[PDB]
């Protein structure tokens, strides 16, 4: 179950969850879209 841990908010995403749906929900609910992004490994 998702929770807004404070000590931001974190929500677990299922491996089978669609990327499009989760991205759309995140953009509509949390904050604006990103003109650029960097992923660090």
């Amino acid at each position: 179950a998702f929770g807004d841990i404070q000590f931001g908010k974190y929500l677990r995403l299922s491996c089978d969850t669609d990327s499009e749906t989760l991205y759309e929900l995140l953009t509509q609910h949390w904050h604006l879209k990103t003109p650029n992004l960097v992923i660090s490994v």
Binding site: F2, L11, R12, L13, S14, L22, L25
Partner: peptide, 10 residues
Amino acid sequence: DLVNFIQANF
């Protein structure tokens, strides 16, 4: 709402 969207995503 946000809770409903989270539940649907789950």
